[PDB]
């Protein structure tokens, strides 16, 4: 049971796992079926690009906030700043999100210029009259790739002031750690004259 110099292997197989083994032999079969589902979807809704337009949003948490990604939908403020009704934006292929709020200007600016580029690049077919001969671009995501925002010039100058930015890290940690006790000390020194 415990023999030799071996690592302790926590293998979780003491249940009836053999009744619940799912083996994906249909990995190739589902990929063909997903492409067939995409092909018959594009045949159904030709010539729209088979997916809605998604915004450039910033990923949460400190691990992933360095990178932007695709959102669920644009905000009400973003669609209104682009100059179209949110119900109208749903019909012309723009995903709109009602719970995401706008609190960052460059994410707001990137999303509204995405909306300006989308409205300039698509056309809306008329309800009555002959629809124009327009080809279908199959991927709206490949039409509008998401670029990372501009951070800085590749080269710049050195600002050597000697402010000891490690001590800036050490002091900011210390004044964060000791804020409440210093405020409590400043409270009791005030009400004791």
């Amino acid at each position: 049971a415990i023999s030799k110099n071996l690592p302790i292997l926590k293998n979780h197989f003491r249940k009836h796992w053999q009744e619940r083994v799912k083996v994906h032999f249909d990995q190739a079969g589902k990929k063909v079926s997903r492409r067939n589902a995409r092909a018959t979807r594009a045949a159904k809704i030709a010539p729209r690009p088979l997916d809605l337009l998604r915004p450039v949003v910033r990923a949460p948490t400190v691990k992933y906030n360095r990178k932007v990604r695709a959102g669920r939908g644009f905000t009400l403020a973003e669609v209104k700043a682009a100059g179209l009704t949110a119900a109208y934006a749903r019909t012309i292929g723009i995903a709109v999100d009602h719970r995401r709020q706008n609190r960052n200007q460059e994410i707001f600016d990137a999303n509204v210029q995405r909306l300006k580029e989308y409205q300039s690049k698509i056309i809306v077919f008329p309800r009555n009259g002959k629809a124009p001969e327009a080809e279908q671009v199959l991927s709206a995501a490949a039409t509008f790739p998401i670029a990372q925002p501009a951070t800085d010039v590749e080269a710049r100058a050195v600002q050597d002031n000697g402010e000891s930015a490690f001590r800036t890290l050490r002091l900011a940690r210390s004044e964060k750690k000791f804020r409440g006790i210093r405020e409590k000390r400043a409270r009791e020194k005030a009400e004791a004259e």
Partner: protein, 99 residues
């Protein structure tokens, strides 16, 4: 409050320019409206008074507000609701003794 541009501290995080956007209508679900204050005032007039709230009113006027807050915490959930109910009992005692 603006950030600090550094990874640790009180206001750790990147400097950004916000918008202070249009506030949602929700965040105001518990906001008291004029008709709803009217309905609750009329219901308080016609329901009479609860048996524990009768006990709470005589505990205010006889045995102390600290003792009544102890009893109202034993009745309701916690002290966040006991303090609200004792303040409500204080208001309707003062309403009963005024004018």
């Amino acid at each position: 409050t603006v950030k600090t541009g550094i990874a640790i501290g009180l206001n750790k995080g990147k400097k950004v320019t916000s918008m202070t956007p249009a506030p949602k209508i929700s965040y105001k679900k518990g906001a008291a409206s004029n008709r709803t204050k009217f309905v609750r005032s009329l219901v308080r007039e016609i329901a009479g008074l609860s048996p524990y709230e009768r006990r709470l009113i005589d505990l205010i006027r006889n045995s102390g507000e600290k003792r009544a807050r102890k009893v109202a915490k034993k009745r309701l959930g916690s002290f966040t609701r006991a303090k609200a109910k004792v303040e409500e009992m204080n208001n309707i005692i003062a309403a009963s003794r005024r004018h």
